[PDB]
Each structure stands twice: as C-alpha cells, then as structure tokens.
Design a protein around this ligand. Structure first.
Ligand SMILES: CN(C)c1cc[n+](Cc2ccc(CCc3ccccc3)cc2)cc1
Ligand SMILES: CN(C)c1cc[n+](Cc2ccc(CCc3ccccc3)cc2)cc1
Lengths: 354, 354
C-alpha cells in the first residue's frame, strides 16, 4: 500500500478539496487517504478517498483516480476525454488542471493476453470497438495518421546513431530490409484495400481493457475500453488488425526482454469471424436483416481488409519500438520487440501472398 | 457581404474540408463560400457554407461558423465548450484546432438592451440561467473568482500611469474613493450574504443572448445563452445581480462614448420578482410545492442576495474598464464607462442603506 511523497500528498489533497463537491470541500488533510496505483515518470496514478467514517453529503464520489502527467496535444486529449465521459464511453471527468486530471475510479482489473481469445470477451471487445467507431469527434477526419506517423518514425529511425554494440547490430539488421521501399509497397497494398475512416482507439490491447469488478461472470457488459490518448481518425482495418496482432504479445513477462511473442496465437479465421460477427451488427444497425449471402460477402471482404491492415500494425509499432530504444527512459527490450514485429510482418505477408 | 483575405479564405476552406464530413470532404476551393460575420483583432467570426447546388450526403451541416482566436485558459475553454455542446446547452462543436473552432451556425439575432425587460424574455433568461447553474463542470469549485479578479484588477489600476490628460484626470477621481478600503467593505457585506456557489456565466448581457430565428413569436424556448468564455464557479448572486445591472447599459450607441447608461432602467422589485419566480422552480425542482409563505421567504432573501451582489458587478466591471483604458486596442469610452459603474455602485449602496 504505497504512499506518495509528502509534496504529492499535499497537492492531491488540495486538488480533491477544491475540485470535488460535498464532503470533500470540508475535508481535513489528516483525514485524506491516498495510495499509489501506478508509479513511473509519466501518467502516475493514485487512488484518493474519503475516510470510511465520513458520510457523503450528496452524490459526490467516495473514491477517485488522480492522474499526473509528469515530465495542442493537451487540448485535444482533454476535449476527447471530456466528450467520451459525457457519452458514458469512458470514466467520468471530475477535474482538469495543468498537472493532471481527477477521474472516476472504476473497480476492475486489466485483461491478460490469453483472455482476449475467450469467445464472450472477444465478442464484447468487437461491440465496444464498433461503438467507439461510431463516435463523431471534433478532430481532423483526413486519414493521414497512419502513414504520417510511419513516415515520421522511419525518418527518425534511419538517423539513429547508437553507441551500444548490441543495439548498433540489431539496428543494422532491421534497416537491411530497405524500409523506405517496403513502406511504399505497404502503402500500395493498403491503397487498394477499401476501409472506412472512423474514430479509432489505435491501441486496443489487453492492458487498456478493464474487466469490471462484480461483472466477471456476466455474459455481456463486463468490459470498458480505456486509455484513449493515441486515438485518431484512421482506417477501421488498422484498429481491428492491431487488436488481432495483440493476441500474440504478452507484456507481463517479468524477465528480459519483458515481453513474449507467439505467432501461433494470432486469431484463426474462425475466431476472426466470431469477432467480426459481433462487430458488424454493432456498427451497422440492420446488418442482421441482410441475406446470409450478403453478410458472407461483407464478412469475407472485412477479413481481407483487417488482415492487410494488420501488416501496418507490425510496421508502425516495429518502427515505434526502434524509436523508443533511442529515446525512452523506461526499461523494455525495444530492439527485440521491433525484430518480433518485423518477423511477424514478413510471416503475415507470406501467408497473404503479398 | 464582406469577403475575408485570400489567406484566410484558403485556411477556412482547408479547415472545413478536413474537419467536416460528407459533401465537405470532396469540396473544391472554387465552390467554397465564406463571408465575414464579425471582424476585429480577436474572435473574428465567419460564416462558411456549401454551394446551394451541392447536396449533402448525410447529416453534415450545410453551413457552419468559423471562430478565429486571432492575437491552461485554452484547455479549460475548449473542454467547457465541448461539454456544453454535448449537453445541448450551446452550439455543437464540429472542429477544434490551434487557431480556432468550427461551430454550429444558429440562425438568430442578438437581443437589444430594451428587450431584457419584456416579461417573457426575462422569464426565459431566468430559466436558462437556472439551467446553466445546475451544470456540474470539471473546474475548481472554490469561489475565489470574484474577489480574486477584483484584487488583481485593483492592483493593476493603482499602478496605471496614463500620458493623456483626460485619462489622468478621470483616473485620479476614480482612485480618490479609497478603493482598497471600499473593496474590503464590499467583501464584508458579501461575506454576510449567503449565496450558493454555482457554475456562472458571468456575462449575461443582451449581446450574449440569441433570439432564435423563427421562434420570435413563441412564448418559450426562443433564446440561447452563448459566449461562455468568462464562465467560472462563482456566487449565484453575482450572475443574477450582473444580469440585472445589464438592463441599464446599452453598448450599441454609435457615437462616443459608444454606450448609454440609465439608472432608471434597473429592474423594479416587481420585475425582479418576476425573474426569480421563473428562476427558482427551474433551479429547485419541487419549489412550486412549498407553501406560499416559504416561497415568499425564499424570494425575499434572494432579492437581498442579488441586489447586494449587483454591487460587485459594478465594482468588478468598473475596475475592468479602467484596465481596458490602459491595455485595450479596441475603441470604447472605457474611463467614462468606469465612472458610470462606480456612480451606479454608490447609488445602489445608498438605496440598500449599506
Ligand atoms: C503509441 N501506441 C498507440 C502504441 C505503441 C506501441 N504499441 C505496441 C506495444 C505495446 C506495449 C508495449 C510494452 C510497453 C511496456 C514497456 C515497459 C514495461 C511494460 C510495458 C510495447 C509495444 C501499441 C500502440
Ligand atoms: C470580462 N467580462 C465577463 C466582462 C467585462 C465587461 N462587462 C461589462 C461590459 C460589457 C460590454 C462592454 C462593451 C464592449 C465594447 C467595446 C467596444 C465596442 C463595443 C462594445 C463594456 C463593458 C461584463 C463582463
């Protein structure tokens, strides 16, 4: 039950006392409870609560989450969060300030990688993503995010000068593929792959899906998608393809390189069909009322769409991870992860016949 | 029908084409229509529209408002605007970017000063303000805004060194009252005046109230309150008192000092009672079900509350206007307006016996 630094405790007390109504407003510092949920250098998370012996005066929360950012993007992220809260699609927003946010506390745990393949879990994720994709949001709707970001990362990657031997070697191998040309071949494939532009999460992995406390044995409505900070208008195929890729990566491994990758855990076509069978009628209202024939065509075209876009998940996050090897202050086997994504990229490309 | 600068036209075209869906996305520059609604140095407003010969593809707007800011506050204002849009309490928000916003276009005109006293108009304003005051918003709830802002302004005002003769003279007269002491006497009065802390508009004047096109002959729901940028948690008495003060000031006068002030146009007690009779049951659900006796007590206490807080509208905006005389690039008789507010302050104080 980790306690924050006295400085952080006092700042948290003041934020809660000033931004939250009812019993919070008259709270004494020596009555304030706070514990560290997640440490680190950025997005530190704390649980803040009233004393058990303090009654609420109205409908103020008894417990809240404090997010500290640490050490235009701010405007967009804050507006998006506020909008998703209003629409009941994310945690409520209780307070916003230069240093962080006070959010609704949602009793829950995160999903584990293996849970992504449970049929009921996968069905709900599909429904939740289809819902998220229907959001109208006040952001640029031109789908420049995917290749814009890949181009940016590629430029950064080409110019990295490592000083450490193993990183120099792994980088040389990764750049030996001719990434500018390969990126262009990917662009060509994806340009011939129709995929609607929708508000995408862009990071639908197990670590960003809450299993809601007390709902674990309920068939539906037991999940919440969170951590929208990378969301943007983007190709629908990317969001689904990226999710499918996440079946293969477990980030909870406690030893170096602090992840495991398993190509054999990518969803089978049967599993993908189960997922898209839940996605489609959640995204397109009267989908169920189409002929078995037209449903099957729509499903077949979507399978090809999402599996082609899955290549962009590998390519983008592969480049991303090389960049983190250069710039990150967090411990993780970034170069080995990069190699794993590019290995998966070529394996997938082969299976596609592309 | 004023046209913007070619540079502004092109930027507006690009914002509309990228942030708005359907027919907007394929629009050609030579088809784009834009006209200036309001010029100036900051918050320039433009109307943007599709050609009459272009059909919409879905439910995209045919016409929008572009606001350009010109030359933490940004985060808070943008979040507030997004939240009020979600709740149907302001215009929809279609796009947000560093330079401005794309908003819903609301066919309307602003109210004139004399229209504030029409019984049906005043009743609706009361209902709209009571609604606004029920908003829960993710902002600091400590009511430091009123005297915080007055202290800030007073400090600035004391140190102004004008070079122009008439401004030097008018300032000396305004500071002759001993404003630090008078501010403290006001604080003392208001500390003894209970007033709930609510989300306040802080600027409920005729220029910020839309009369909705086609609703002009409807008894109810013909107005919208807009221009929330000065909104904050604050004493309810201030928002209502400030509105009452606005009955006296007409900002449409075309000759120097570009406003008229008339002490005799302040609402009578009968008129104030009509306003609060609409406010209370809009703010407190089952108010109508209280005894005539308890309703009358609540009305009497509110009359005293709002009329005491009206003194703070005079004092705050009086100081504000002195500051604008020093710093503003807009033409207006700021020193004469300041004198008018302080004249009203003392007149009101006398009538209160305070
Ligand atoms: C920026 N963005 C939306 C993404 C970046 C990377 N990825 C893939 C990914 C996800 C998680 C990780 C693990 C991060 C981590 C680092 C240190 C300890 C534990 C986890 C690595 C790569 C998906 C989306
Ligand atoms: C910052 N704030 C919420 C306020 C500031 C001033 N006032 C009173 C007020 C309102 C309008 C004006 C007129 C502004 C104006 C300036 C030049 C041309 C036309 C109007 C002056 C004073 C109310 C609220």
């Amino acid at each position: 039950d980790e306690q924050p630094e006295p400085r952080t405790r006092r700042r948290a007390y003041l934020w809660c006392k000033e931004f939250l109504p009812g019993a919070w407003r008259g709270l004494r510092e020596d009555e304030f409870h706070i514990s560290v949920i997640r440490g680190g250098l950025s997005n530190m998370l704390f649980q803040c609560s009233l004393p058990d012996t303090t009654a609420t005066l109205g409908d103020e929360p008894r417990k809240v989450l404090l997010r500290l950012y640490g050490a235009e993007a701010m405007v967009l992220e804050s507006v998006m969060f506020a909008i998703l809260a209003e629409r009941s699609l994310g945690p409520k927003l209780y307070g916003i300030f230069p240093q962080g946010r006070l959010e609704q506390f949602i009793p829950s745990r995160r999903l584990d990688t293996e849970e992504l393949s449970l049929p009921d879990i996968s069905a709900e994720i599909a429904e939740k993503m289809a819902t998220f994709h229907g959001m109208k949001m006040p952001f640029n709707k031109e789908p420049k995010w995917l290749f814009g970001t890949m181009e940016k990362y590629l430029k950064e990657v080409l110019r990295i000068k490592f000083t450490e031997e193993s990183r120099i070697k792994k980088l040389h191998k990764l750049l030996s593929y001719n990434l500018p040309l390969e990126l262009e071949n990917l662009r060509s494939l994806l340009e011939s792959t129709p995929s609607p532009v929708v508000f995408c999460h862009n990071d639908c992995q197990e670590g960003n899906i809450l299993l809601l406390e007390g709902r674990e044995n309920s068939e539906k409505q037991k999940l919440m998608l969170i951590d929208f900070e990378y969301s943007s208008y983007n190709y629908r195929g990317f969001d689904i393809g990226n999710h499918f890729c996440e079946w293969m990566y477990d980030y909870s491994y406690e030893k170096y390189p602090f992840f495991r990758a398993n190509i054999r855990k990518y969803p089978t076509k049967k599993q993908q069909l189960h997922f898209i069978s839940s996605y489609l009628p959640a995204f397109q209202n009267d989908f169920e009322n189409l002929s078995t024939e037209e449903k099957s065509i729509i499903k077949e075209e979507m399978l090809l769409e999402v599996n082609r876009f899955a290549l962009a998940s590998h390519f983008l996050w592969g480049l991303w991870s090389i960049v983190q090897a250069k710039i990150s202050s967090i411990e993780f086997g970034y170069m080995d992860y990069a190699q794993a994504r590019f290995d998966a990229y070529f394996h997938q490309k082969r299976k596609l016949g592309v």
